[PDB]
Design an enzyme around this catalytic site. Structure first.
Site, PDB file in Angstrom:
ATOM      1  N   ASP A   1      31.940  37.116  51.561  1.00 56.52           N
ATOM      2  CA  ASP A   1      30.501  37.094  51.784  1.00 56.52           C
ATOM      3  C   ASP A   1      29.953  35.707  51.447  1.00 56.52           C
ATOM      4  O   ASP A   1      30.703  34.759  51.209  1.00 56.52           O
ATOM      5  CB  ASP A   1      29.825  38.195  50.972  1.00 56.52           C
ATOM      6  CG  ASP A   1      28.463  38.567  51.517  1.00 56.52           C
ATOM      7  OD1 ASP A   1      27.985  37.866  52.432  1.00 56.52           O
ATOM      8  OD2 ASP A   1      27.874  39.559  51.039  1.00 56.52           O
TER       9      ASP A   1
HETATM   10  P1  LIG Z   1      24.800  36.106  52.084  1.00 60.07           P
HETATM   11  O1  LIG Z   1      24.075  36.288  53.402  1.00 60.07           O
HETATM   12  O2  LIG Z   1      25.368  37.374  51.510  1.00 60.07           O
HETATM   13  O3  LIG Z   1      23.759  35.482  51.009  1.00 60.07           O
HETATM   14  C1  LIG Z   1      23.780  35.969  49.637  1.00 60.07           C
HETATM   15  C2  LIG Z   1      22.373  35.944  49.049  1.00 60.07           C
HETATM   16  C3  LIG Z   1      22.481  36.026  47.526  1.00 60.07           C
HETATM   17  C4  LIG Z   1      21.713  34.611  49.405  1.00 60.07           C
HETATM   18  C5  LIG Z   1      21.526  37.129  49.548  1.00 60.07           C
HETATM   19  O4  LIG Z   1      21.962  37.585  50.816  1.00 60.07           O
HETATM   20  C6  LIG Z   1      20.003  37.070  49.503  1.00 60.07           C
HETATM   21  O5  LIG Z   1      19.392  36.348  50.286  1.00 60.07           O
HETATM   22  N1  LIG Z   1      19.391  37.845  48.616  1.00 60.07           N
HETATM   23  C7  LIG Z   1      18.100  37.535  48.008  1.00 60.07           C
HETATM   24  C8  LIG Z   1      18.149  36.322  47.099  1.00 60.07           C
HETATM   25  C9  LIG Z   1      18.883  36.576  45.798  1.00 60.07           C
HETATM   26  O6  LIG Z   1      19.975  37.135  45.791  1.00 60.07           O
HETATM   27  N2  LIG Z   1      18.299  36.190  44.661  1.00 60.07           N
HETATM   28  C10 LIG Z   1      17.319  35.121  44.570  1.00 60.07           C
HETATM   29  C11 LIG Z   1      17.914  33.889  43.939  1.00 60.07           C
HETATM   30  S1  LIG Z   1      17.391  33.491  42.255  1.00 60.07           S
HETATM   31  C12 LIG Z   1      18.541  34.399  41.287  1.00 60.07           C
HETATM   32  O7  LIG Z   1      19.231  35.286  41.727  1.00 60.07           O
HETATM   33  C13 LIG Z   1      18.597  33.936  39.864  1.00 60.07           C
HETATM   34  C14 LIG Z   1      19.676  34.596  39.077  1.00 60.07           C
HETATM   35  C15 LIG Z   1      19.656  34.247  37.596  1.00 60.07           C
HETATM   36  C16 LIG Z   1      19.705  32.772  37.288  1.00 60.07           C
HETATM   37  C17 LIG Z   1      20.903  32.050  37.847  1.00 60.07           C
HETATM   38  C18 LIG Z   1      22.242  32.532  37.347  1.00 60.07           C
HETATM   39  C19 LIG Z   1      22.781  31.783  36.155  1.00 60.07           C
HETATM   40  C20 LIG Z   1      22.221  32.225  34.836  1.00 60.07           C
HETATM   41  C21 LIG Z   1      22.793  31.499  33.650  1.00 60.07           C
HETATM   42  C22 LIG Z   1      24.288  31.317  33.697  1.00 60.07           C
HETATM   43  C23 LIG Z   1      24.907  30.962  32.370  1.00 60.07           C
HETATM   44  C24 LIG Z   1      24.073  30.057  31.504  1.00 60.07           C
HETATM   45  C25 LIG Z   1      24.581  29.947  30.090  1.00 60.07           C
END
Ligand SMILES: *P(=O)(O)OCC(C)(C)[C@H](O)C(=O)NCCC(=O)NCCSC(=O)CCCCCCCCCCCCC
Ligand SMILES: CCCCCCCCCCCCCCCCCC(=O)OC[C@H](COP(=O)(O)OCCN)OC(=O)CCCCCCCCCCCCCCCCC
Ligand SMILES: CCCCCCCCCCCCCCCCCC(=O)OC[C@H](COP(=O)(O)OCCN)OC(=O)CCCCCCCCCCCCCCCCC
Ligand code: SF4
Ligand code: SF4
Lengths: 186, 115, 441, 238, 242, 185, 82, 81, 66
Positions: free
Chosen positions: G39
């Site tokens: 994916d």
């Molecule tokens: P493909 O067509 O399958 O595309 C996959 C995605 C994910 C783009 C989806 O199809 C999609 O468009 N869905 C909606 C968007 C989404 O999934 N989320 C919005 C993005 S912001 C987000 O998800 C933030 C997550 C938390 C912060 C980042 C992660 C890391 C956190 C800290 C890590 C470790 C630190 C110590």
């Protein structure tokens, strides 16, 4: 110089020869040492001030027993309400005027039906639309509400009897003279 | 004005879903690119595979969002969490607070007290 | 809200309404010497956006455990050698949720919180909260309370400036003036501890006047202190004003222009140092200020030296105001004479029924403040201290927001400091007079 | 000695210096503003407000004429009409020319008023001024070069740039008489907005505001009606 | 003790007696009527110059509030910064108030100062957990940190803001503590752990739970409705009889 | 910046003075530069401080001054008969700004309204005095005592047994402070 | 570099990835999504893994273009690092 | 890791002026025999060393630059066309 | 202390007390007794002393505590 005498400054003094010595060897013999007077400072202590002497003060009207209902001094419950004007009845105030400066007479009946229309036209079309159809001279009458120029925002002093800008002026005496980059204002 | 910091990104709205689609991939890429660099900054004793697993799961919880204005709040939070992590403003306890290293049945929950 | 789910019209932004400067009259690429090649991107080859995100300047955590931090500041400095390229102050290390805790208190119960914001200027912080509630209460506090609040308002101003100016001199390396001035403030906390029962957190100034009346020996002892405080100002004036090491550590340091100081939300000496005549006690007179004469110190170069000269003048102006208050102190009550707002005398509460009911309700329910909101501001010793209080019509505030002068000042730190050396940053922390109880709240 | 203000002398407000030419600058700023409002419909109260304020303040600045203005303006017409090529922005650029180390000037039109903006070369000490203040574009391209690189070098500038000492086909523009420091105070007593340097900066921000108002179209109907309950608070029924 | 020759004991001076004290009763709101007319005209004038964005204005005592829609933040604050009669060149403050009964929860309240005219003004707009607000950092350098506080405490995005991140809360902190639904003591608390040799985070337990005495609020309304103080020049006319 | 209206008279600074306009003599200017003159004055001012009395007191043999209104540790007080003055109204529990007071009451064996629990968390208290302000019967007071530092925090959780013992020990000052401060309350 | 060298290491990495449907489907012209069952996030991890192995940085603009093994091979030859 | 030193030009000149004052110490302990003829050489040596010092003061080689220029556009009004 | 005061106080109290006072107060103080605690503590006053030093206590116990 703007020095007051050491002899008025309520600090412990030198005496005799040490007074002569100190006035010989200091930069300013009128400067005090900062040491307070044991007989005068905090004497008596507040813990030996007599209780009977202090009297709790009551004012005549508020504290009287026969010339004050509470409701004529209940200023907290006489609090102002915020006065809110929306575009719906700013068009109205432009349409027919105000209890101060009415536009047309509104004599008796048949004037009330015009009164509601002024409010109704405000709720149906707002200020921008109102100025659109009356043209530019209605907008010019808007400035006529303030004498032709736009209004000035209100100042917050009223030290002169009217709410105004405080007039800062250069102080008569400048403490740093002119020698230093700090100027004195009143 | 005052300078924006090293990873400071201006807050802007997603133009369309294609915009959001490309930004989310950019954010996920930037996180998993930085996992080796997070490990030595914060002296993580786990391997980087675990760190990237956690990044994946954080992104997966917002998988099923179909609202541009919810995604952009989410893209905001990750930008600030990335900037916060890379500039080493947070410390090891904060980064380890992020790694967790409920009863699985009714009967298990019942017998222990609620959970 | 709902429309934001899918793509719609983009919300307009300041970048959109940008306008191009006219080329006929435009002169220069930088009318400000703050951005005149004393920031980041003045060295190296490539910018720190692409291919530069892999390198760092020399970055040092100046605080929190640092003397010049004066407490609880985490000022992340990026040094080019010994020069500051970027300053990122990190605050919230004394954030304790004061503004949320105020929402679960009565208006009386929230007043001690204001003692602990700028915690060298307790009675002044109390005043701005007492003047906002009194405005929403639509009451007029008696003349004796107004003169007590202006006199203790200027005793507080002197107390703050002693801590502020002499902490600032201590950072630059001058130790002795700090010790002398802390006997004077130790003197002035007796006046606090004699009218209230506390050296520091008085809880004295309250909506409706002051808690108790001054004791019968206090005015004479304040006047006795006043007859010698001029000499105290002059001997600290005697070690710093002409000192050539003092002048070359502050003159030309932390320079902010008049037009930028307003745009940076600067108030107080931070603003008056730049040449603007502005005093909140002159422009919106509160308490008994419009009944006294005082001058307003205004600098001309907007640097640490002018700000020092303005604050040393306010010592002399505060002592001048204090003398007039001692002379003009009227008789009468120190509490608004309404027991529905202020607590009745203990004598009356033990003697009469309506006094007991009112004492009981004021200490359990509190008094109700008529609904509305207000922004109230006073000339705090550190600048325009303000409060935005929203009222439900009930006995607990719906919202208490504190506008802290030092919050607005620490934000302009990188603007005025980038390009100076590490010692010059120490100089600018002390001239900007920060207490992080108000910064973080 | 004390007749005239000294340009760039500190005014008492930090970063605010004495304006080299405050009168003309306000007219330039006011006439420029009265020109940009014309892309606003006449029924806009914003137009009528700015249009009213600017004209009121314009007539005050005109009321304070520097000494000898009529004599200089008669001379300066005979310069612009005789040598319009020298001061034409379409010919010498908006910056007055390319040689910053000599005098430069263009003619500008606002509302139909005619302005001449001049750039006297910056006054610096002799001992830290290299080549009279010429601009250093760096070393000429030497060695084996392609034509494009020689083009990018500035090779077309040999045939258009001027030796500053070459002054035969040109006339030395003498600028406008200035306001004696008494008149500056007298003018600013009329305007009543502080120093004339303060009045100028408020005027120029007023000029830039018009472009933002025009774009936003601030005179058109309300965008978002507040929804029900939006501005309700805790009020008690009257 | 070597006493000074001209400093008498000040307590030893007799004070002349003060007996009956008269004190006039004053409504502190009465002083604000001499500029009621002026504050309503200024608020009305802005309503006419910028009718695309300004929804309403209110005047309470000496405070004039301007209600605007969020899409007009840049033009309205541009007008209040640069207009000759509106030289509001400081932002005193920027805060938010949460009204969970309103769809748009958050009220963004800005406070401006005009030292030229000794004038203050309040502008209010609205947002929710997903609607952002245009930043004013391009017009007011001092607004940078205020908007960061609103974003941290309430969770309001400011589109166009450079470096929008937390300013008040702990680094890894999750939640917006000035929201009404956010509990007073939060969800987590920290301790140093002996087994792990670090600070760890835990679900919040309290040795003594917070005692909310809000249920002791009066069963009777204590303030009433107040009074109307609108001047005649901003009220509609009344149809005179016959 | 400056007030609207006529600009302040003489607000514009005079034109800058040149190097040869400064009316200081070269002998004075050069003398001050090379002789370090202004800093010798500062050295001298320290010398006369050296010959001034110090401000220091010898704690604990000498104590700094405290007033009748001083707020120290809490004590529960009794009437001249030894009856507790506390009647369990709970007013101080309500007004506390830090929720440091926990009170449980009942009818006592003789039908008297008396507390069964009376705790002050001395690590939650803010020492504001609001609790003694509100007392209808002068029961809860803050002593003039500030020296009660403890080895553990459990020693700072005062029960009714500890607070009555405090009043039983400190009553002579508590009475003398109330006597001296009552008329102002 | 050598084309066969910059392809052999990819097969080991791609087969080494945990949850591809089957290691046989990897060819010189195989697609991550249509064939290898990866994916969006899996594909971003695969370009990330490829960049780490070749010790090169793949920029955002051309990182998206790599949706197939052949595109990875051409980019690896195009970028001068190994 | 490498760190900018903004005063290293001082370190280079400090290196050579030390050699110069050390070369003047045998003269200090030999003045009675050096006398006038030896004094001249010592002054010729210190004059050349001093010229290179005037070179270091003149060029601002001993200056660390640090801090954190007026209008030149005159408008003229001819009025109407 | 200063030489005129220290010798004057030393003359009044005696050498043995002078060294005892250099052991606890570290000062040389003379004054008149005002009373004794239930704990044996001794209290003196001397208005001819620097402010806040006119009253002091001689602690009964060696391991003196406030
Ligand atoms: P493909 O067509 O399958 O595309 C996959 C995605 C994910 C783009 C989806 O199809 C999609 O468009 N869905 C909606 C968007 C989404 O999934 N989320 C919005 C993005 S912001 C987000 O998800 C933030 C997550 C938390 C912060 C980042 C992660 C890391 C956190 C800290 C890590 C470790 C630190 C110590
Ligand atoms: C004996 C009695 C005194 C005993 C106690 C001595 C004082 C002890 C004080 C503590 C140690 C000294 C501290 C020095 C502080 C002065 C200093 O370092 O400041 C640096 C200052 C900067 O100078 P600069 O910026 O270049 O020029 C303009 C200055 N506004 O530079 C200066 O301000 C100049 C300082 C001058 C010092 C030079 C030595 C003076 C001796 C005479 C030199 C002889 C040559 C000159 C001949 C006279 C010519 C008329
Ligand atoms: C009369 C003889 C001249 C005496 C020196 C006068 C002087 O002090 O000038 C110093 C000189 C100033 O040069 P400058 O930097 O250009 O001044 C600012 C204006 N541009 O500073 C210079 O740049 C000149 C270079 C330094 C000259 C100083 C020589 C001192 C060397 C020690 C001599 C004793 C042996
Ligand atoms: S207020 Fe006083 S009397 Fe009432 S319960 Fe509390 S301590 Fe007892
Ligand atoms: S003094 Fe202490 S116990 Fe009394 S109300 Fe204040 S915090 Fe509570």
């Amino acid at each position: 110089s703007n020095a007051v005498s050491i002899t008025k400054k309520y600090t412990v003094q030198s005496t005799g020869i040490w007074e002569r010595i100190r006035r010989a060897l200091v930069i300013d013999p009128n400067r005090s040492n900062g040491v307070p007077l044991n007989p005068y400072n905090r004497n008596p202590s507040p813990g030996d001030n007599p209780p009977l002497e202090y009297t709790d003060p009551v004012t005549i009207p508020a504290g009287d027993i026969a010339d004050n209902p509470y409701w004529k001094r209940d200023f907290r419950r006489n609090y102002p309400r915020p006065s809110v004007i929306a575009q719906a009845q700013q068009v109205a105030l432009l349409s027919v005027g105000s209890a101060a400066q009415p536009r047309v007479e509104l004599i008796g009946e048949e004037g009330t039906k015009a009164l509601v229309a002024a409010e109704e036209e405000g709720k149906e079309k707002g200020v921008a639309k109102y100025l659109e159809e009356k043209g530019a001279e209605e907008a010019k009458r808007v400035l006529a509400l303030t004498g032709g120029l736009p209004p000035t925002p209100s100042g917050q002093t009223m030290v002169t009897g009217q709410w105004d800008v405080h007039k800062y002026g250069l102080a008569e005496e400048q403490s740093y003279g002119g020698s230093y980059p700090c100027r004195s204002f009143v | 004005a005052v300078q924006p910091t090293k990873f400071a990104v201006t807050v802007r709205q997603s133009r369309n879903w294609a915009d959001a689609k490309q930004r989310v991939i950019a954010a996920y890429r930037a996180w998993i690119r930085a996992a080796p660099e997070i490990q030595t900054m914060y002296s993580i004793p786990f391997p980087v595979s675990h760190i990237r697993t956690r990044i994946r799961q954080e992104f997966e919880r917002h998988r099923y969002v179909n609202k541009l204005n919810v995604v952009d709040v989410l893209l905001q939070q990750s930008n600030a969490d990335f900037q916060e992590t890379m500039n080493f403003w947070r410390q090891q306890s904060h980064v380890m607070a992020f790694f967790k290293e409920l009863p699985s049945n009714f009967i298990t929950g019942f017998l222990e007290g609620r959970n | 809200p709902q429309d934001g789910f899918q793509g719609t019209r983009l919300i307009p932004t300041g970048a959109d309404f940008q306008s191009p400067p006219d080329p006929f009259i435009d002169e220069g690429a930088r009318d400000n010497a703050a951005n005149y090649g004393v920031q980041k991107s003045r060295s190296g080859v490539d910018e720190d956006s692409v291919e530069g995100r892999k390198v760092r300047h020399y970055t040092v955590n100046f605080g929190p455990q640092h003397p010049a931090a004066h407490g609880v500041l985490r000022l992340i400095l990026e040094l080019n050698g010994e020069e500051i390229v970027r300053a990122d102050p990190h605050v919230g290390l004394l954030h304790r949720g004061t503004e949320k805790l105020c929402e679960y208190k009565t208006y009386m119960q929230a007043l001690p919180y204001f003692d602990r914001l700028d915690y060298v200027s307790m009675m002044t912080n109390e005043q701005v909260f007492s003047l906002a509630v009194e405005k929403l209460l639509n009451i007029e506090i008696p003349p004796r309370a107004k003169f007590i609040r202006t006199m203790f308002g200027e005793i507080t101003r002197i107390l703050n400036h002693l801590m502020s100016v002499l902490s600032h001199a201590m950072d630059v390396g001058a130790l002795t003036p700090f010790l002398w001035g802390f006997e004077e403030r130790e003197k002035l906390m007796e006046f606090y501890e004699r009218v209230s029962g506390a050296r520091l957190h008085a809880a004295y100034v309250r909506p409706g006047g002051v808690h108790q009346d001054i004791p019968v020996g206090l005015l004479d002892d304040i006047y006795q202190w006043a007859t010698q405080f001029g000499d105290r100002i002059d001997e600290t004036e005697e070690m710093l004003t002409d000192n050539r090491i003092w002048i070359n550590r502050l003159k030309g340091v932390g320079v902010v222009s008049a037009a930028d100081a307003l745009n940076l939300s600067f108030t107080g000496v931070m603003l008056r140092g730049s040449g603007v005549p502005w005093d909140v006690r002159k422009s919106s007179p509160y308490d008994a200020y419009d009944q006294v004469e005082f001058d307003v110190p205004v600098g001309i170069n907007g640097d640490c030296y002018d700000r020092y000269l303005c604050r040393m003048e306010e010592f002399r102006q505060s002592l001048r105001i204090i003398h007039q208050c001692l002379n003009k102190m009227p008789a009468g009550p120190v509490r608004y004479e309404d027991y529905k707002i202020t607590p009745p005398p203990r004598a009356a509460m033990k003697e009469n029924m309506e006094a007991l009911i009112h004492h009981f309700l004021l200490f359990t329910k509190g008094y109700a403040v008529p609904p509305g909101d207000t922004y109230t501001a006073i000339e705090a010793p550190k600048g325009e201290m303000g409060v935005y209080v929203v009222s439900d019509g009930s006995e607990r505030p719906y919202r208490v927001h504190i506008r802290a002068p030092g919050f607005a000042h620490l934000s302009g730190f990188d603007h005025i400091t980038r390009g100076h050396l590490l010692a010059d940053a120490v100089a600018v922390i002390g001239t900007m007079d920060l207490v992080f109880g108000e910064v973080d709240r | 000695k004390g007749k005239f203000l000294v340009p760039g002398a500190p005014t008492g407000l930090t970063g605010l210096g004495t304006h080299p030419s405050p009168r003309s600058a306000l007219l330039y700023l006011y006439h420029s503003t009265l020109e940009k409002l014309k892309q606003i419909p006449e029924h806009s109260v914003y137009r009528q407000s700015v249009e009213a304020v600017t004209r009121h303040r314009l007539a005050l600045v005109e009321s304070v004429v520097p000494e000898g203005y009529d004599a200089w303006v008669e001379r300066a017409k005979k310069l612009l009409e005789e040598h319009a090529d020298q001061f034409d922005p379409t010919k010498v650029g908006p910056e007055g020319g390319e040689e910053v180390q000599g005098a430069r000037a263009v003619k500008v039109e606002r509302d139909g008023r005619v302005f001449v903006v001049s750039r006297l070369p910056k006054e610096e000490d002799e001992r830290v001024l290299e080549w009279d203040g010429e601009v250093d574009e760096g070393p000429e391209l030497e060695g084996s070069r392609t034509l494009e690189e020689k083009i990018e070098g500035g090779l077309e500038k040999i045939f258009t740039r001027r030796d500053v000492k070459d002054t035969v086909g040109r006339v030395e523009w003498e600028p406008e008489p200035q306001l004696t420091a008494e008149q500056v105070a007298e003018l600013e007593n009329k305007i009543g907005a502080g120093l004339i340097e303060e009045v100028i900066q408020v005027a120029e921000g007023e000029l830039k505001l018009v472009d933002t108002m025009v774009k936003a179209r601030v005179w058109e109907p309300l965008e978002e009606q507040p929804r029900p309950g939006q501005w309700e608070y805790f009020e008690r029924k009257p | 003790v070597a006493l000074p020759k001209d400093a008498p004991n000040p307590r030893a001076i007799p004070r002349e007696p003060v007996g009956e004290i008269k004190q006039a009763l004053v409504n502190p709101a009465d002083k604000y009527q001499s500029k009621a007319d002026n504050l309503h005209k200024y608020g009305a004038w802005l309503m006419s110059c910028l009718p695309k964005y300004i929804q309403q204005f209110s005047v309470w005592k000496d405070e004039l509030t301007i209600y605007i829609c969020p899409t007009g933040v840049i033009p309205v604050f541009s007008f209040l910064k640069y207009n000759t009669n509106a030289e509001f060149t400081q932002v005193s403050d920027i805060t938010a108030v949460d009204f969970p009964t309103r769809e748009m929860r958050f009220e963004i309240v800005y406070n401006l100062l005009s030292v030229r005219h000794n004038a203050r003004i309040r502008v209010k707009t609205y947002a929710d957990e997903v609607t952002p607000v245009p930043s004013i950092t391009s017009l007011y350098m001092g607004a940078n940190w205020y908007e960061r506080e609103v974003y941290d405490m309430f969770g309001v995005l400011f589109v166009g803001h450079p470096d929008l991140r937390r300013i008040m809360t702990d680094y890894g902190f999750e939640g917006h503590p000035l929201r009404k639904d956010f509990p007073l003591t939060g969800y987590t608390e920290i301790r140093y752990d002996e087994e792990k040799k670090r600070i760890v985070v835990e679900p919040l337990e309290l040795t003594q739970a917070f005692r909310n005495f809000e249920g002791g609020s009066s069963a009777w309304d204590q303030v009433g409705p107040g009074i109307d103080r609108t001047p005649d020049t901003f009220k509609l006319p009344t149809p005179k009889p016959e | 910046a400056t007030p609207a209206g006529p600009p302040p008279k003489n607000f514009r600074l005079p034109p800058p003075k040149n190097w040869d306009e400064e009316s200081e003599s070269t002998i004075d200017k050069v003398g001050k530069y090379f002789l370090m003159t202004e800093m010798l004055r500062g050295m001298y001012v320290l010398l006369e401080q050296f010959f001034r009395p110090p401000y220091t007191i010898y704690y604990p043999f000498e104590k700094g001054p405290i007033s009748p209104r001083f707020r120290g540790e809490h004590a529960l007080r009794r009437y001249p008969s030894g009856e507790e003055r506390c009647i369990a109204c709970k007013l101080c529990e309500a007004v506390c700004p830090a929720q440091a007071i926990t009170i449980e009451a009942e009818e006592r064996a003789d039908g008297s309204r008396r507390t069964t629990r009376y705790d002050i968390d001395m690590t939650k208290c803010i020492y504001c005095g609001f609790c003694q302000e509100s007392c209808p019967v002068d029961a809860i007071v803050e002593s003039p005592n500030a020296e009660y530092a403890t080895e553990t925090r459990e020693e700072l959780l005062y029960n009714k047994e500890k607070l009555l013992a405090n009043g039983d020990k400190w009553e002579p000052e508590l009475a003398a402070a109330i006597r001296a401060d009552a008329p102002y309350r | 570099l050598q084309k066969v060298e910059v392809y052999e290491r990819i097969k080991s990495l791609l087969a080494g990835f945990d949850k591809v449907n089957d290691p046989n489907n990897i060819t010189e012209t195989a697609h991550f999504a249509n064939d290898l069952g990866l994916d969006s996030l899996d594909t971003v991890e695969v370009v990330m893994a490829i960049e780490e192995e070749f010790s090169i940085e793949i920029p955002d603009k051309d990182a998206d273009q790599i949706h197939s093994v052949d595109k990875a091979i051409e980019y690896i030859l195009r970028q001068p690092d190994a | 890791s490498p760190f900018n030193i903004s005063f290293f030009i001082y370190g280079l000149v400090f290196l050579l002026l030390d050699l110069e004052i050390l070369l003047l110490y045998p003269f200090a302990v030999s003045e009675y025999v050096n006398s006038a003829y030896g004094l001249a050489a010592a002054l010729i040596f210190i004059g050349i060393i001093t010229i290179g010092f005037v070179y270091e003061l003149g060029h601002d080689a001993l200056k660390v630059h640090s801090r954190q220029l007026k209008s030149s556009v005159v408008i003229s009004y001819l009025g109407n066309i | 202390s200063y030489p005129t005061r220290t010798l004057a106080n030393l003359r009044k109290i005696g050498l043995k007390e002078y060294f005892r006072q250099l052991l606890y107060i570290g000062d040389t103080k003379y004054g008149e007794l005002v009373g004794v605690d239930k704990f044996g503590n001794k209290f003196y006053e001397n208005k001819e002393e620097l402010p806040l030093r006119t009253r002091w206590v001689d602690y009964a116990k060696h391991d003196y505590d406030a």
